[PDB]
Ligand binder design. Sequence first.
Ligand SMILES: CC(C)=CCC[C@](C)(O[C@@H]1O[C@H](CO)[C@@H](O)[C@H](O)[C@H]1O)[C@H]1CC[C@]2(C)[C@@H]1[C@H](O)C[C@@H]1[C@@]3(C)CC[C@H](O[C@@H]4O[C@H](CO)[C@@H](O)[C@H](O)[C@H]4O)C(C)(C)[C@@H]3CC[C@]12C
Length: 390
Amino acid sequence: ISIALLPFLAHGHISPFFELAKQLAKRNCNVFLCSTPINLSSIKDKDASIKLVELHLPSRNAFETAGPTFSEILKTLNPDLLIYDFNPSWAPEIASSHNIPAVYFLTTAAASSSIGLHAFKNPGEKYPFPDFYDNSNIIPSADNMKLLHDFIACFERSCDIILIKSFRELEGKYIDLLSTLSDKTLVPVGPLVQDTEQIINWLDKRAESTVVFVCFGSEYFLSNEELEEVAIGLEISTVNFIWAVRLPEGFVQRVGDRGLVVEGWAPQARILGHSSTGGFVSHCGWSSIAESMKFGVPVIAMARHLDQPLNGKLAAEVGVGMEVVRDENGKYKREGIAEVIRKVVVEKSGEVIRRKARELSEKMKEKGEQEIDRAVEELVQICKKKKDEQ
Ligand SMILES: CC(C)=CCC[C@](C)(O[C@@H]1O[C@H](CO)[C@@H](O)[C@H](O)[C@H]1O)[C@H]1CC[C@]2(C)[C@@H]1[C@H](O)C[C@@H]1[C@@]3(C)CC[C@H](O[C@@H]4O[C@H](CO)[C@@H](O)[C@H](O)[C@H]4O)C(C)(C)[C@@H]3CC[C@]12C
């Protein structure tokens, strides 16, 4: 009944854990507990769950040292189950030292994880779905070696089931692959979407499904030359657009009101949910795609590093978006962006895409709630099995 959550010390990981807390606490009267430092706790002071504090010990940070602190926290709570992240490393160890089942939560796509888990569990290599990853390539980094170890470990430490912030409609094939690879029952919980006025006032005065949202920055990388390239792409697309930047860089006084730029935080969920939106030029972050496909918005894939290229090519495989064609020197170009923007948002050829993103969206709003219901009842199963084990 009582569940405990230890999200990693990353804002890119706190929101899924908090939304999962809201989802599990509202059903089956789950006595909820969430453990993370006060700094990361006081940012989500909004709307059934109980929060916890954590004090580190003074003399990538000191999170690997809060072992005994979390041990005392668990000895205090003694919860029925712990849902940990991926980098705590000692969270399943401490959960076992208190005889608490540890369930691993993966806030990432299943195919990106399947690549690595299959490279690990099968040095017989091969890939059952090779339209994604193929062989006949050569690559080599201790940076990535540590990451992959932290990745496999948290995949093995999970008890029976592995929670994942994804759904079957996008990659149930890869979900079942991950299940058969890790020998654990992959239980999806769907996406976890949370939730000044000038943006709304401008977006309401437009036609339906004629505006393209852009947020390739998303608090990562964005150079002025790349700013110029994506700006010329947006301009020669002759389309209404709302672009959010991180921080010469164009002439907004010139192509104003046909578009709109924001310096920092935009209502991404509210913009994508608006009926006048029909495009999302994204960096292919997992949370971004999970939000985009929930509102029936196709995905212009401008990927770069990490798991984003795999997410983008998965979206292209399921036919809910399209990727930009990089130029000769491996860089997206004005035309490489405008081509796909026009072919997706306004062209009749991309209607297929435009339709699938809608046909999928309703499905997510049709089978909702029951995903997390089955996830909750599977957790009750593991706890009861543990008690029966004695
Ligand atoms: C083993 C081998 C032989 C080849 C396969 C690996 C691969 C093809 O890539 C090969 O990797 C090889 C490594 O040796 C090299 O040869 C070469 O680089 C390349 O070919 C690609 C494909 C699968 C891959 C994408 C992998 C990457 O590497 C490592 C990632 C990583 C583990 C990176 C950190 C990411 O976490 C976020 O990012 C920040 C840091 O945690 C956080 O702040 C943020 O919040 C998080 O969301 C998360 C989302 C967890 C992913 C999960 C997916 C994974 C496994």
